[PDB]
Design an enzyme around this catalytic site. Structure first.
Site, PDB file in Angstrom:
ATOM      1  N   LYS A  27       0.819  -1.207   0.000  1.00 14.79           N
ATOM      2  CA  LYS A  27       0.000   0.000   0.000  1.00 14.79           C
ATOM      3  C   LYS A  27       0.855   1.261   0.000  1.00 14.79           C
ATOM      4  CE  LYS A  27      -3.709   2.381   2.491  1.00 14.79           C
ATOM      5  NZ  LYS A  27      -4.516   2.451   3.741  1.00 14.79           N
ATOM      6  N   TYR A  28       2.058   1.197   0.571  1.00 17.21           N
ATOM      7  CA  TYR A  28       2.889   2.378   0.747  1.00 17.21           C
ATOM      8  C   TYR A  28       4.190   2.353  -0.042  1.00 17.21           C
ATOM      9  CZ  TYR A  28      -0.170   3.615   4.668  1.00 17.21           C
ATOM     10  OH  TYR A  28      -1.254   3.948   5.448  1.00 17.21           O
TER      11      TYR A  28
ATOM     12  N   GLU B 286       6.749  -0.023  -3.297  1.00 21.86           N
ATOM     13  CA  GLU B 286       7.102  -1.181  -4.105  1.00 21.86           C
ATOM     14  C   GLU B 286       8.580  -1.483  -3.900  1.00 21.86           C
ATOM     15  OE1 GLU B 286       5.895  -0.030  -8.099  1.00 21.86           O
ATOM     16  OE2 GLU B 286       4.086  -1.258  -7.902  1.00 21.86           O
TER      17      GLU B 286
ATOM     18  N   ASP C  45       4.427  -2.189  14.012  1.00 18.57           N
ATOM     19  CA  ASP C  45       3.992  -2.997  12.876  1.00 18.57           C
ATOM     20  C   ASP C  45       4.713  -4.341  12.876  1.00 18.57           C
ATOM     21  OD1 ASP C  45       2.509  -3.689  10.687  1.00 18.57           O
ATOM     22  OD2 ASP C  45       3.628  -2.471   9.246  1.00 18.57           O
TER      23      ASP C  45
END
Ligand SMILES: Brc1cc2[nH]nnc2nc1Br
Length: 333
Positions: A48-49, A51, A155
């Site tokens: 999502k944030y 690559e 996370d």
């Protein structure tokens, strides 16, 4: 009358005793490199944030990993950069090698030391009892270090733990959600993956600390020793707390809410119900019994607590009998 404040039981004021530049990432100036030093080889994964690509540093023929960031706030980029630089050289912490930017699209990208594209999620099922304790001890080294540096990861999950099993190396990655701990500061509860969110995030208690990472670590340990992925399998953020309450019981949950005077979302009183605290033997069967021991269950129970202040710290976890053999073997080296 408002929530009851909370403080971390360890490393409470480490950032207060440091210069402002250490944690004031909004004022941090980024040391940009030259992107012409790197050629992308192949894509490793998306997100999502960002690559992630495998790349080559053409100046020294060194293999690297390039993380091209998706458009996010500039302060969040400075936060991940500052945290990576503060933790550079720490035990089992991924090493930030360079910071470059596409001169055309103005897209920032982080360059890391190369690691084999294999994480903890792909390797856990083939690991023995000793391998689980060994790598869990390595994760605790990284967590205790960054906590001692006044930083919480926020996370912790198997996808963010890169493991080179041939050399038994381990690296904790993805620090885009990490933050500096400041006593009395209220943080965003919209962090971490659903299956690893601590109870403080689900009941919207903002004054949390390093103990959030210890809950996420407990979710990893439960999924590995029980071979149940994920362990707390909620359909959403509300149902995620219901799944936790069906295991840890609702009475300890309401005592936790009562202790800190937390305003519970009215959508919870209809779905939480009444549930007893289950015994860990309920999740043991013939296919995971070789990974379950009295030491593992005792260690897991001390991590998965509603009250964040009652969970083991990273340093306390490393001294549990669950790691006695691992600690002794590392002393043999
Ligand atoms: Br190395 C490496 C570092 C990362 N930081 N955020 N995601 C990441 N992925 C890999 Br692979």
């Amino acid at each position: 009358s408002g929530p009851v404040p909370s403080r971390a039981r360890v490393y409470t004021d480490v950032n207060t005793h440091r210069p402002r530049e250490y944690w004031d990432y909004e004022s941090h100036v980024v040391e940009w490199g030259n992107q012409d030093d790197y050629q992308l080889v192949r894509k490793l994964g998306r997100g999502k944030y960002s690559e992630v690509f495998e790349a080559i540093n053409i100046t020294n023929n060194e293999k690297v990993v390039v993380k091209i960031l998706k458009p996010v706030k500039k302060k969040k980029i400075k936060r991940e950069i500052k945290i990576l630089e503060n933790l550079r050289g720490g035990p089992n912490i991924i090493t930030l090698a360079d910071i470059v930017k596409d001169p055309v699209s103005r897209t920032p990208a982080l360059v890391f030391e190369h690691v084999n594209n294999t994480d903890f999620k792909q390797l856990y099922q083939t690991l023995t009892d000793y391998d689980i304790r060994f790598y869990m001890y390595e994760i605790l080294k990284a967590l205790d270090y960054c906590h001692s540096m006044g930083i919480m990861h926020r996370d912790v999950k198997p996808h963010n733990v890169m493991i080179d099993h041939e050399h038994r190396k381990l690296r904790l990655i993805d620090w885009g959600l990490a933050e500096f701990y400041h006593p009395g500061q209220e943080y965003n509860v919209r962090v971490a993956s659903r299956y690893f969110k601590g109870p403080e995030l689900l009941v919207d208690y903002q004054m949390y600390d390093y103990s959030l990472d210890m809950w996420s670590l407990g979710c990893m340990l439960a999924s590995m020793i029980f071979r149940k992925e994920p362990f707390f399998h909620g359909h959403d953020n509300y149902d995620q707390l219901v799944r936790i309450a069906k295991v840890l019981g609702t009475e300890d949950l309401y005592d936790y809410i009562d202790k800190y005077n937390i305003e519970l979302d009215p959508r919870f009183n209809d779905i939480l119900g009444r549930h007893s605290r289950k015994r860990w033997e309920r999740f043991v069967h013939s296919e995971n019994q070789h990974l379950v021991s009295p030491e593992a269950l005792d260690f897991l129970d001390k991590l998965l607590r509603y009250d964040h202040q009652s969970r083991l710290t990273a340093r306390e976890a490393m001294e549990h009998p669950y790691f006695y053999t691992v600690v002794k073997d590392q002393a043999r080296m």
